[PDB]
Short mmCIF file of C-alpha atoms in Angstrom, two decimals:
data_model
loop_
_atom_site.label_atom_id
_atom_site.label_comp_id
_atom_site.label_asym_id
_atom_site.label_seq_id
_atom_site.Cartn_x
_atom_site.Cartn_y
_atom_site.Cartn_z
CA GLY A 714 53.68 94.55 -30.88
CA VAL A 715 55.98 93.15 -28.24
CA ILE A 716 54.15 89.86 -28.24
CA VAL A 717 54.50 89.50 -31.98
CA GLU A 718 58.20 90.06 -31.77
CA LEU A 719 58.34 87.61 -28.88
CA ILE A 720 56.43 85.04 -30.77
CA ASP A 721 58.58 85.84 -33.79
CA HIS A 722 61.84 85.33 -31.93
CA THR A 723 60.87 82.10 -30.21
CA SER A 724 59.48 80.63 -33.31
CA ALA A 725 62.72 81.36 -35.04
CA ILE A 726 64.53 79.49 -32.40
CA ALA A 727 62.21 76.55 -32.62
CA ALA A 728 62.66 76.24 -36.40
CA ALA A 729 66.50 76.16 -36.40
CA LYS A 730 66.43 73.36 -33.83
CA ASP A 731 63.94 71.40 -35.91
CA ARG A 732 61.12 71.75 -33.37
CA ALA A 733 58.31 71.77 -35.95
CA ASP A 734 55.73 71.03 -33.26
CA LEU A 735 56.51 74.28 -31.42
CA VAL A 736 56.47 76.42 -34.59
CA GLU A 737 52.96 75.23 -35.52
CA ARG A 738 51.88 75.79 -31.88
CA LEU A 739 53.25 79.33 -32.09
CA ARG A 740 51.61 79.70 -35.50
CA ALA A 741 48.28 78.86 -33.87
CA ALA A 742 48.90 81.27 -30.99
CA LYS A 743 49.68 84.11 -33.40
CA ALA A 744 46.54 83.23 -35.41
CA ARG A 745 44.51 83.40 -32.20
CA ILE A 746 45.39 86.93 -31.40
CA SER A 747 44.65 88.55 -34.90
CA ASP A 748 41.33 86.53 -35.33
CA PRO A 749 40.31 86.36 -31.61
CA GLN A 750 36.74 85.39 -32.45
CA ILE A 751 35.12 87.22 -29.52
CA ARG A 752 31.57 85.93 -29.85
CA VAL A 753 28.63 88.02 -28.60
CA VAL A 754 25.24 86.28 -28.80
CA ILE A 755 22.24 88.47 -29.64
CA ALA A 756 19.31 86.74 -27.95
CA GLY A 757 15.61 87.33 -27.29
CA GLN A 758 12.07 86.40 -28.26
CA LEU A 759 10.00 86.95 -31.38
CA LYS A 760 8.96 90.46 -32.35
CA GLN A 761 11.38 92.19 -30.06
CA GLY A 762 13.57 93.89 -32.70
CA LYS A 763 16.85 91.84 -32.57
CA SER A 764 17.71 91.59 -36.25
CA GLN A 765 16.92 95.26 -36.83
CA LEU A 766 19.23 95.98 -33.87
CA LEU A 767 22.09 94.01 -35.43
CA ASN A 768 21.61 95.73 -38.80
CA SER A 769 21.42 99.16 -37.22
CA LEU A 770 24.50 98.30 -35.15
CA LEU A 771 26.82 97.02 -37.95
CA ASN A 772 25.50 99.27 -40.75
CA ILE A 773 25.27 96.38 -43.21
CA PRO A 774 22.48 94.22 -44.49
CA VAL A 775 24.02 90.82 -43.73
CA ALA A 776 21.44 90.04 -41.06
CA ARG A 777 17.79 89.37 -41.77
CA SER A 778 12.80 85.75 -40.47
CA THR A 779 15.97 83.78 -39.80
CA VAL A 780 15.83 80.07 -39.24
CA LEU A 781 19.50 79.41 -38.58
CA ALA A 782 22.12 80.72 -36.18
CA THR A 783 24.33 83.15 -38.05
CA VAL A 784 27.78 84.25 -36.94
CA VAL A 785 28.97 87.58 -38.31
CA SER A 786 32.68 88.30 -38.14
CA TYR A 787 35.17 90.57 -39.86
CA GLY A 788 36.23 89.96 -43.44
CA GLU A 789 37.40 92.55 -45.96
CA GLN A 790 35.27 90.90 -48.63
CA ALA A 791 31.81 89.36 -48.04
CA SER A 792 32.07 85.56 -47.61
CA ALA A 793 29.99 82.77 -46.05
CA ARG A 794 30.25 79.12 -45.03
CA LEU A 795 28.04 76.41 -43.53
CA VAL A 796 29.02 74.62 -40.35
CA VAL A 797 27.80 71.10 -41.01
CA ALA A 798 27.52 68.45 -38.30
CA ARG A 799 29.23 65.07 -38.46
CA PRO A 800 28.00 61.85 -36.79
CA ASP A 801 29.07 60.67 -33.33
CA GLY A 802 30.59 63.94 -32.10
CA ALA A 803 33.15 64.25 -34.88
CA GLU A 804 34.50 67.71 -35.76
CA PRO A 805 31.96 69.68 -37.82
CA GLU A 806 32.68 70.39 -41.49
CA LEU A 807 33.08 73.84 -43.08
CA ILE A 808 31.51 74.27 -46.51
CA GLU A 809 32.13 77.46 -48.45
CA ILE A 810 28.97 78.78 -50.02
CA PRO A 811 28.17 81.69 -52.25
CA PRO A 812 26.82 84.71 -50.44
CA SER A 813 23.59 84.66 -52.51
CA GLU A 814 22.62 81.64 -50.44
CA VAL A 815 22.56 83.16 -46.95
CA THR A 816 19.34 84.92 -47.87
CA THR A 817 17.37 81.68 -48.01
CA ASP A 818 17.06 78.44 -46.04
CA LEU A 819 20.38 76.80 -45.65
CA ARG A 820 18.77 74.65 -43.11
CA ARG A 821 18.54 72.21 -45.93
CA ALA A 822 21.21 73.66 -48.19
CA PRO A 823 21.98 71.04 -50.88
CA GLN A 824 25.71 71.27 -50.19
CA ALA A 825 24.93 69.90 -46.73
CA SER A 826 23.82 66.59 -48.27
CA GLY A 827 21.08 65.99 -45.67
CA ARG A 828 23.26 66.48 -42.59
CA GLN A 829 22.21 68.80 -39.78
CA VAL A 830 23.45 72.37 -40.32
CA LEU A 831 24.44 73.75 -36.91
CA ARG A 832 24.91 77.36 -38.04
CA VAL A 833 26.10 79.75 -40.73
CA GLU A 834 29.28 81.80 -40.51
CA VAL A 835 29.47 84.89 -42.70
CA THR A 836 31.94 87.75 -43.02
CA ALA A 837 31.33 91.47 -43.25
CA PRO A 838 33.60 94.48 -43.69
CA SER A 839 32.30 96.43 -40.71
CA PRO A 840 34.78 98.56 -38.73
CA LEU A 841 33.00 97.30 -35.63
CA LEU A 842 34.20 93.72 -36.22
CA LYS A 843 37.92 94.27 -36.97
CA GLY A 844 38.87 94.17 -33.28
CA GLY A 845 37.50 90.62 -33.24
CA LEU A 846 33.89 90.90 -32.18
CA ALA A 847 31.67 88.28 -33.73
CA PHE A 848 27.90 88.51 -33.41
CA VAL A 849 25.70 85.45 -33.31
CA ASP A 850 22.26 86.09 -34.71
CA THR A 851 19.72 83.65 -33.33
CA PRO A 852 16.72 82.23 -35.17
CA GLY A 853 13.19 83.40 -34.44
CA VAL A 854 11.97 81.91 -31.19
CA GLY A 855 8.88 82.27 -29.02
CA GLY A 856 6.50 82.13 -31.96
CA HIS A 857 4.29 79.47 -33.53
CA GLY A 858 6.39 76.72 -35.07
CA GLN A 859 9.52 78.19 -33.50
CA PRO A 860 11.95 76.97 -30.82
CA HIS A 861 11.60 78.02 -27.19
CA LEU A 862 13.77 80.89 -25.95
CA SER A 863 15.80 78.39 -23.88
CA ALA A 864 17.07 76.84 -27.12
CA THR A 865 19.39 79.85 -27.33
CA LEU A 866 21.44 78.39 -24.45
CA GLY A 867 23.28 76.08 -26.85
CA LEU A 868 25.16 79.09 -28.25
CA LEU A 869 26.41 80.37 -24.90
CA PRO A 870 29.12 77.93 -23.75
CA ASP A 871 31.25 79.12 -26.67
CA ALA A 872 30.13 82.73 -26.27
CA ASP A 873 31.89 85.48 -24.32
CA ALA A 874 28.87 87.74 -23.97
CA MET A 875 25.12 87.91 -24.52
CA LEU A 876 22.85 90.75 -25.54
CA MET A 877 19.34 90.05 -24.34
CA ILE A 878 16.87 91.89 -26.50
CA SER A 879 13.59 92.71 -24.88
CA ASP A 880 11.29 95.31 -26.30
CA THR A 881 9.58 98.03 -24.29
CA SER A 882 5.97 97.03 -24.98
CA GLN A 883 5.60 95.50 -21.51
CA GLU A 884 7.86 94.30 -18.70
CA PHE A 885 9.63 90.89 -18.62
CA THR A 886 7.59 87.74 -18.87
CA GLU A 887 8.50 84.78 -16.64
CA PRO A 888 10.12 82.84 -19.50
CA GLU A 889 12.45 85.77 -20.20
CA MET A 890 13.40 85.90 -16.52
CA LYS A 891 14.07 82.17 -16.18
CA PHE A 892 16.15 82.28 -19.35
CA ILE A 893 18.25 85.21 -18.15
CA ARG A 894 19.19 83.48 -14.88
CA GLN A 895 19.97 80.25 -16.75
CA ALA A 896 22.01 82.13 -19.34
CA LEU A 897 24.09 83.78 -16.60
CA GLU A 898 24.99 80.35 -15.24
CA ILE A 899 26.86 79.65 -18.48
CA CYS A 900 27.72 83.17 -19.70
CA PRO A 901 28.16 85.75 -16.87
CA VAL A 902 28.98 88.77 -19.10
CA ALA A 903 25.59 89.96 -20.38
CA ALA A 904 23.35 92.99 -20.93
CA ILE A 905 19.66 93.67 -21.53
CA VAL A 906 18.96 95.92 -24.50
CA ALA A 907 15.59 97.62 -24.13
CA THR A 908 14.64 98.21 -27.74
CA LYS A 909 11.90 100.20 -29.47
CA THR A 910 12.03 103.16 -27.08
CA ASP A 911 10.87 105.21 -30.05
CA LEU A 912 7.60 103.31 -30.49
CA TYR A 913 6.34 103.14 -26.86
CA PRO A 914 6.01 106.47 -24.91
CA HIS A 915 5.94 104.89 -21.40
CA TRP A 916 9.12 102.92 -22.11
CA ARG A 917 10.82 104.51 -19.16
CA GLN A 918 9.12 102.95 -16.21
CA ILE A 919 9.33 99.52 -17.67
CA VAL A 920 13.08 99.68 -17.87
CA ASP A 921 13.27 100.70 -14.28
CA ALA A 922 10.77 98.12 -13.24
CA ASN A 923 12.61 95.38 -15.04
CA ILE A 924 15.69 96.65 -13.60
CA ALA A 925 14.16 96.39 -10.20
CA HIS A 926 13.15 92.86 -10.87
CA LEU A 927 16.64 91.69 -11.66
CA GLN A 928 18.02 93.05 -8.42
CA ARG A 929 15.10 91.61 -6.52
CA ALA A 930 15.56 88.29 -8.32
CA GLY A 931 19.31 88.39 -7.87
CA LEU A 932 20.09 88.77 -11.53
CA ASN A 933 23.13 91.04 -12.17
CA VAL A 934 22.50 92.37 -15.65
CA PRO A 935 22.82 96.00 -16.76
CA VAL A 936 19.95 97.42 -18.84
CA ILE A 937 20.68 99.55 -21.90
CA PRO A 938 17.77 101.38 -23.58
CA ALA A 939 18.02 101.75 -27.36
CA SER A 940 16.19 102.63 -30.56
CA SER A 941 17.29 100.89 -33.76
CA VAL A 942 14.83 103.19 -35.54
CA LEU A 943 16.64 106.42 -34.45
CA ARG A 944 20.02 104.84 -35.38
CA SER A 945 18.74 104.22 -38.89
CA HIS A 946 17.67 107.87 -39.14
CA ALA A 947 21.06 108.81 -37.79
CA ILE A 948 23.07 107.21 -40.61
CA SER A 949 20.96 109.14 -43.10
CA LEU A 950 20.97 112.65 -41.80
CA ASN A 951 24.51 112.67 -40.50
CA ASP A 952 23.29 113.81 -37.20
CA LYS A 953 25.28 112.84 -34.21
CA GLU A 954 22.59 114.58 -32.28
CA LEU A 955 20.43 111.46 -32.67
CA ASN A 956 23.11 108.92 -31.85
CA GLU A 957 23.49 109.95 -28.18
CA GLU A 958 19.69 110.07 -28.50
CA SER A 959 19.53 106.49 -29.79
CA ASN A 960 21.72 105.48 -26.82
CA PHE A 961 23.67 103.13 -29.11
CA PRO A 962 27.02 104.47 -27.84
CA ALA A 963 25.95 103.02 -24.48
CA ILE A 964 25.75 99.60 -26.10
CA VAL A 965 29.25 99.93 -27.60
CA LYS A 966 31.02 100.99 -24.37
CA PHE A 967 29.62 97.92 -22.61
CA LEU A 968 30.80 95.87 -25.57
CA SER A 969 34.14 97.69 -25.38
CA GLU A 970 34.65 97.82 -21.60
CA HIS A 971 33.01 94.58 -20.45
CA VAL A 972 33.43 92.27 -23.43
CA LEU A 973 36.18 93.31 -25.82
CA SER A 974 38.60 94.70 -23.19
CA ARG A 975 38.02 91.91 -20.64
CA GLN A 976 38.54 89.16 -23.27
CA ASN A 977 41.61 90.80 -24.89
CA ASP A 978 43.40 90.70 -21.58
CA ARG A 979 42.55 87.04 -21.36
CA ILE A 980 43.78 86.32 -24.87
CA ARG A 981 47.16 88.02 -24.26
CA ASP A 982 47.71 86.04 -21.04
CA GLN A 983 47.17 82.66 -22.67
CA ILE A 984 49.49 83.62 -25.58
CA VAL A 985 52.28 84.82 -23.24
CA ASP A 986 51.99 81.49 -21.40
CA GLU A 987 52.22 79.83 -24.83
CA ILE A 988 55.44 81.75 -25.57
CA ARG A 989 56.89 80.89 -22.15
CA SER A 990 56.00 77.19 -22.44
CA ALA A 991 57.52 76.97 -25.95
CA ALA A 992 60.69 78.69 -24.75
CA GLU A 993 60.95 76.43 -21.70
CA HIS A 994 60.62 73.33 -23.87
CA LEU A 995 63.61 74.65 -25.81
CA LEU A 996 65.43 75.56 -22.59
CA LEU A 997 65.18 71.99 -21.32
CA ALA A 998 67.45 70.56 -24.01
CA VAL A 999 69.85 73.49 -23.70
CA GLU A 1000 70.31 73.22 -19.93
CA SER A 1001 70.39 69.42 -20.00
CA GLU A 1002 73.34 69.57 -22.40
CA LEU A 1003 74.96 72.28 -20.27
CA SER A 1004 74.67 70.09 -17.18
CA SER A 1005 76.25 67.16 -19.03
CA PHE A 1006 79.24 69.33 -19.92
CA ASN A 1007 79.68 71.31 -16.70
CA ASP A 1008 78.76 68.45 -14.35
CA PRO A 1009 79.96 65.13 -15.77
CA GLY A 1010 79.52 63.15 -12.53
CA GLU A 1011 75.77 63.76 -12.53
CA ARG A 1012 75.15 62.52 -16.06
CA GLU A 1013 73.82 59.31 -14.53
CA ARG A 1014 71.17 61.16 -12.52
CA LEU A 1015 70.41 63.58 -15.34
CA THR A 1016 69.86 60.89 -17.96
CA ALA A 1017 68.03 58.55 -15.56
CA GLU A 1018 65.64 61.37 -14.71
CA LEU A 1019 65.08 62.40 -18.33
CA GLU A 1020 64.47 58.81 -19.36
CA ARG A 1021 61.82 58.43 -16.67
CA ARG A 1022 59.96 61.61 -17.57
CA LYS A 1023 60.07 60.62 -21.26
CA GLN A 1024 58.47 57.19 -20.62
CA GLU A 1025 55.82 58.76 -18.42
CA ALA A 1026 55.12 61.22 -21.20
CA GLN A 1027 54.86 58.28 -23.63
CA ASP A 1028 52.68 56.15 -21.32
CA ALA A 1029 50.41 59.21 -21.11
CA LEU A 1030 49.60 58.47 -24.77
CA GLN A 1031 48.30 55.05 -23.64
CA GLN A 1032 44.74 53.86 -23.52
CA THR A 1033 45.37 52.97 -19.90
CA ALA A 1034 46.71 56.39 -18.89
CA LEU A 1035 45.00 57.74 -15.81
CA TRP A 1036 44.05 61.07 -17.37
CA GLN A 1037 42.48 59.21 -20.32
CA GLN A 1038 40.68 56.78 -17.98
CA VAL A 1039 39.30 59.65 -15.96
CA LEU A 1040 38.23 61.31 -19.20
CA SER A 1041 36.62 58.24 -20.76
CA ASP A 1042 34.84 57.04 -17.62
CA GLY A 1043 33.82 60.60 -16.79
CA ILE A 1044 32.18 61.17 -20.18
CA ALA A 1045 30.37 57.81 -20.06
CA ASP A 1046 29.14 58.54 -16.54
CA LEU A 1047 28.11 62.08 -17.28
CA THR A 1048 26.19 60.95 -20.36
CA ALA A 1049 24.09 58.53 -18.31
CA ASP A 1050 23.63 61.02 -15.47
CA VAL A 1051 22.49 63.78 -17.85
CA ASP A 1052 19.88 61.51 -19.41
CA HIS A 1053 18.79 60.46 -15.93
CA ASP A 1054 18.49 64.12 -14.82
CA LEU A 1055 16.38 65.03 -17.84
CA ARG A 1056 13.95 62.14 -17.46
CA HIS A 1057 13.58 62.93 -13.76
CA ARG A 1058 12.64 66.52 -14.60
CA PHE A 1059 10.27 65.42 -17.36
CA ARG A 1060 8.54 62.87 -15.14
CA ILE A 1061 7.86 65.62 -12.59
CA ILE A 1062 6.48 67.76 -15.43
CA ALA A 1063 4.32 64.97 -16.88
CA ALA A 1064 2.86 64.21 -13.45
CA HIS A 1065 1.78 67.82 -12.90
CA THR A 1066 0.19 68.08 -16.34
CA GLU A 1067 -1.75 64.84 -15.84
CA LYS A 1068 -3.13 66.26 -12.60
CA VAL A 1069 -4.08 69.47 -14.44
CA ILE A 1070 -5.82 67.37 -17.08
CA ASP A 1071 -7.83 65.47 -14.51
CA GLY A 1072 -8.96 68.78 -13.25
CA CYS A 1073 -10.89 70.25 -16.11
CA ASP A 1074 -12.31 69.60 -19.52
CA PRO A 1075 -9.10 69.19 -21.39
CA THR A 1076 -11.10 70.01 -24.49
CA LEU A 1077 -11.82 73.59 -23.06
CA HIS A 1078 -8.23 74.46 -21.99
CA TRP A 1079 -6.14 72.42 -24.39
CA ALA A 1080 -4.35 75.42 -25.88
CA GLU A 1081 -3.32 76.72 -22.45
CA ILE A 1082 -2.41 73.19 -21.21
CA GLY A 1083 -0.29 72.53 -24.30
CA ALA A 1084 1.40 75.92 -23.90
CA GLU A 1085 2.33 75.37 -20.24
CA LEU A 1086 3.74 71.92 -21.04
CA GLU A 1087 5.87 73.07 -23.98
CA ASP A 1088 7.28 75.86 -21.82
CA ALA A 1089 7.91 73.57 -18.84
CA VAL A 1090 9.58 70.90 -20.98
CA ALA A 1091 11.77 73.38 -22.84
CA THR A 1092 12.80 75.01 -19.57
CA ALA A 1093 13.74 71.64 -18.05
CA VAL A 1094 15.89 71.01 -21.10
CA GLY A 1095 17.48 74.37 -20.35
CA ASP A 1096 18.07 73.50 -16.69
CA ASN A 1097 19.36 70.07 -17.71
CA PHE A 1098 21.75 71.66 -20.21
CA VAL A 1099 23.10 74.12 -17.65
CA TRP A 1100 23.64 71.31 -15.14
CA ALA A 1101 25.34 69.22 -17.82
CA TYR A 1102 27.53 72.18 -18.80
CA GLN A 1103 28.58 72.72 -15.18
CA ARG A 1104 29.40 69.03 -14.74
CA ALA A 1105 31.37 68.89 -17.99
CA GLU A 1106 33.48 71.84 -16.87
CA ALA A 1107 34.09 70.18 -13.52
CA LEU A 1108 35.10 66.97 -15.28
CA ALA A 1109 37.33 68.86 -17.71
CA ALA A 1110 38.87 70.58 -14.70
CA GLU A 1111 39.57 67.25 -13.01
CA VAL A 1112 41.26 65.79 -16.08
CA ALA A 1113 43.53 68.85 -16.29
CA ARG A 1114 44.62 68.43 -12.66
CA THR A 1115 45.14 64.67 -13.19
CA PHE A 1116 47.34 65.45 -16.25
CA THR A 1117 49.21 68.10 -14.29
CA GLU A 1118 49.57 65.74 -11.36
CA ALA A 1119 51.63 63.42 -13.51
CA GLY A 1120 54.03 66.18 -14.43
CA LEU A 1121 53.11 65.49 -18.05
CA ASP A 1122 53.53 69.19 -18.83
CA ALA A 1123 56.56 69.92 -16.63
CA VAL A 1124 59.71 70.81 -18.55
CA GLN A 1125 62.04 72.28 -15.93
CA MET A 1126 65.60 70.92 -15.67
CA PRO A 1127 66.07 68.48 -12.99
CA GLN A 1128 67.89 70.33 -10.16
CA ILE A 1129 71.27 68.67 -9.42
CA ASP A 1130 74.90 69.16 -8.09
CA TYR A 1131 41.02 74.31 -29.48
CA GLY A 1132 41.79 75.54 -32.99
CA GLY A 1133 39.20 73.32 -34.65
CA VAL A 1134 35.58 73.98 -35.62
CA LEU A 1135 33.32 74.48 -32.59
CA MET A 1136 30.10 72.50 -32.19
CA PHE A 1137 27.85 75.17 -30.66
CA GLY A 1138 24.32 75.48 -32.02
CA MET A 1139 20.66 75.80 -31.02
CA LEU A 1140 19.25 73.32 -28.53
CA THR A 1141 16.49 71.03 -29.70
CA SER A 1142 13.43 69.65 -27.99
CA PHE A 1143 10.12 69.77 -29.70
CA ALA A 1144 9.30 70.25 -33.32
CA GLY A 1145 7.92 73.69 -32.45
CA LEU A 1146 5.92 75.84 -30.06
CA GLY A 1147 2.13 75.48 -30.40
CA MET A 1148 2.53 72.27 -32.38
CA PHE A 1149 1.46 69.76 -29.80
CA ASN A 1150 -2.22 69.59 -30.38
CA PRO A 1151 -3.12 65.93 -30.76
CA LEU A 1152 -6.40 64.11 -31.14
CA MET A 1153 -20.46 61.72 -19.75
CA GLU A 1154 -18.32 60.12 -17.08
CA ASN A 1155 -17.14 58.01 -19.91
CA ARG A 1156 -16.39 60.88 -22.24
CA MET A 1157 -14.45 62.64 -19.56
CA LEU A 1158 -12.55 59.59 -18.58
CA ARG A 1159 -11.74 58.72 -22.13
CA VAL A 1160 -10.72 62.18 -22.94
CA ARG A 1161 -8.68 62.88 -19.88
CA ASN A 1162 -6.90 59.56 -20.07
CA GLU A 1163 -6.01 59.88 -23.66
CA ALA A 1164 -4.54 63.30 -23.22
CA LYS A 1165 -2.22 62.16 -20.57
CA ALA A 1166 -1.18 59.24 -22.65
CA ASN A 1167 -0.50 61.64 -25.45
CA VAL A 1168 1.37 63.77 -23.00
CA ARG A 1169 3.60 60.97 -21.75
CA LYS A 1170 4.82 59.96 -25.22
CA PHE A 1171 5.36 63.61 -26.14
CA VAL A 1172 7.43 63.95 -22.99
CA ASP A 1173 9.20 60.67 -23.85
CA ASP A 1174 9.84 61.62 -27.48
CA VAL A 1175 11.55 64.84 -26.40
CA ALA A 1176 13.72 63.00 -23.86
CA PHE A 1177 14.76 60.75 -26.74
CA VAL A 1178 15.53 63.72 -29.00
CA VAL A 1179 17.42 65.69 -26.35
CA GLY A 1180 19.45 62.67 -25.25
CA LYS A 1181 21.02 62.02 -28.66
CA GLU A 1182 22.40 65.59 -28.92
CA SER A 1183 23.55 65.38 -25.29
CA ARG A 1184 25.39 62.18 -26.21
CA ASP A 1185 27.10 63.50 -29.33
CA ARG A 1186 27.92 66.72 -27.48
CA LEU A 1187 29.78 64.86 -24.77
CA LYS A 1188 31.57 62.80 -27.43
CA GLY A 1189 32.65 66.05 -29.06
CA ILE A 1190 33.98 67.34 -25.75
CA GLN A 1191 35.77 64.04 -25.15
CA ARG A 1192 37.45 64.30 -28.55
CA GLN A 1193 38.56 67.90 -28.07
CA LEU A 1194 40.11 67.30 -24.64
CA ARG A 1195 41.81 64.07 -25.73
CA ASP A 1196 43.33 65.78 -28.79
CA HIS A 1197 44.59 68.62 -26.59
CA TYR A 1198 46.48 66.47 -24.08
CA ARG A 1199 47.86 63.93 -26.54
CA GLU A 1200 49.39 66.92 -28.34
CA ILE A 1201 50.97 68.17 -25.11
CA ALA A 1202 52.11 64.65 -24.24
CA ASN A 1203 53.76 64.38 -27.65
CA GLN A 1204 55.54 67.75 -27.25
CA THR A 1205 56.72 66.83 -23.79
CA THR A 1206 57.82 63.41 -25.02
CA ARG A 1207 59.73 65.19 -27.79
CA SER A 1208 61.33 67.85 -25.59
CA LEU A 1209 62.47 65.19 -23.14
CA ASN A 1210 63.95 62.97 -25.85
CA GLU A 1211 65.99 65.91 -27.29
CA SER A 1212 67.20 66.78 -23.87
CA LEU A 1213 68.26 63.15 -23.32
CA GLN A 1214 70.36 62.67 -26.55
CA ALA A 1215 71.79 66.20 -26.24
CA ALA A 1216 73.11 65.15 -22.82
CA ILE A 1217 74.51 61.93 -24.31
CA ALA A 1218 76.11 63.50 -27.37
CA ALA A 1219 77.83 66.02 -25.11
CA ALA A 1220 79.58 63.29 -23.16
CA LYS A 1221 81.22 62.13 -26.33
CA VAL A 1222 82.89 65.44 -27.14
CA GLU A 1223 86.51 65.93 -26.18
CA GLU A 1224 88.22 68.71 -24.26
CA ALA A 1225 89.19 70.72 -27.28
CA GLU A 1226 85.64 71.46 -28.27
CA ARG A 1227 83.57 71.59 -25.13
CA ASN A 1228 84.33 75.12 -24.08
CA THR A 1229 83.44 76.38 -27.51
CA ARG A 1230 80.21 74.41 -27.30
CA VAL A 1231 79.33 75.54 -23.84
CA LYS A 1232 79.64 79.19 -24.51
CA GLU A 1233 77.09 78.95 -27.24
CA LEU A 1234 74.88 76.97 -24.95
CA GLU A 1235 74.99 79.72 -22.37
CA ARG A 1236 74.32 82.35 -24.96
CA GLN A 1237 71.39 80.29 -26.04
CA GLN A 1238 70.30 79.63 -22.52
CA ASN A 1239 70.46 83.24 -21.64
CA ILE A 1240 68.37 84.23 -24.61
CA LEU A 1241 65.51 81.92 -23.77
CA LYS A 1242 65.65 82.94 -20.16
CA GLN A 1243 65.51 86.59 -21.24
CA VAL A 1244 62.59 85.69 -23.42
CA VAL A 1245 60.99 83.78 -20.67
CA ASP A 1246 61.38 86.35 -17.98
CA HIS A 1247 60.97 89.18 -20.41
CA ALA A 1248 57.57 87.97 -21.49
CA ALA A 1249 56.42 86.28 -18.35
CA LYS A 1250 55.34 89.49 -16.73
CA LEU A 1251 53.47 91.10 -19.63
CA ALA A 1252 50.74 89.25 -17.83
#
């Protein structure tokens, strides 16, 4: 549309002036708006009907039972790739894979060569996904041998929305409620889908009750009833009649009005700012040369200024640069603080459990004791992760201000006279739910004491496991932010060095060909300004 033409124009200008850095930047911006990747996470516990919901939604059997996070996005032809982790927070690796593989256990897909597979990304030719919606199927959780529901939080920082699937067999359990509040801390745009309305006749009150609950508990989430079963019948008989009846259109409007529409506005704004910034980088050299022509007596101040801003832009690429110091020290600090937070939470949990143990015959309540512990530990991991996420955002925010405070992105004339692979995946704590089940005054003492001891290592082992991922995660964040600002510093360094020589080369021209040169600089200047002002307000 207008933006494409705008991008098109600007890019053309950047290429004739040999600004290869701006063209690629504009190439990335253009790529962002056609493949927006608007990720919507489909969450919820075991047996609630999530996968059937996704299949009924997209009309395609790509979804499945699943053991690995699966991202479904638009592609004319079916295709699939594995997102494979690299050590020490390095950028994950994409590995194409034949579609026949998605059906079974890529957790240890041979192509992965023993590395941890974070997720699978597959394509599907569903008219629903063309606009840029991408659905993240989550593995089975809440069951024996499965992750806790809070493990789903690891998918949300990179998500734009969440659909919380909760079936209508009974009202919300406490774990569902704690998870919803935690999820909203990271991903505010969310909705509850009350599934299986077709199977349970009293489904109605439960939705209202749950709805009550949220308001009473302060959780702002809309509830959308639905039946995947009716939808499936609907495809078959070509009956719209059933579709209003399935209430699936209600799911789409929320996806349209609260997810797709909200995010599209946000994508256009960042791309217009990208166009404006690129144009202004080009304008700097144009107006610097103009000043050198039209105002010869200020060449000293013009060049002295430009030289200063260039060095500062170059020093910003230094190990010692304040923004990089703040970043490096902040990540190191946050890493230690996050581990400290977790172990504080776990210690509180372990202490409670040990008291519980000394209060009964652990051998007569071991299943319930184990269950409470696994839930408490997994929830603490969730609370720790949310806290860590909030602190990382605050740190990232501080580094941006620090960068900005140095004028390392400023390209106005002096007045005189992440496109890489994301690292999001499931959280990890314990091997699985229901899997911690380890081996008169004397019997009781021996038994009670051993359980606790078993409990404290279990708690310690998880802290160990969680801490490594926390560490590599922060390293990944450090890498992404560093790459971002070194790129900007290089562009700014570049734009300032062109402006400097352009001002020098203009002072060597003679009277005969200055006026000819200026006129074309004003034509050029006017064009960028038209572009800048012209696209600045399509905000």
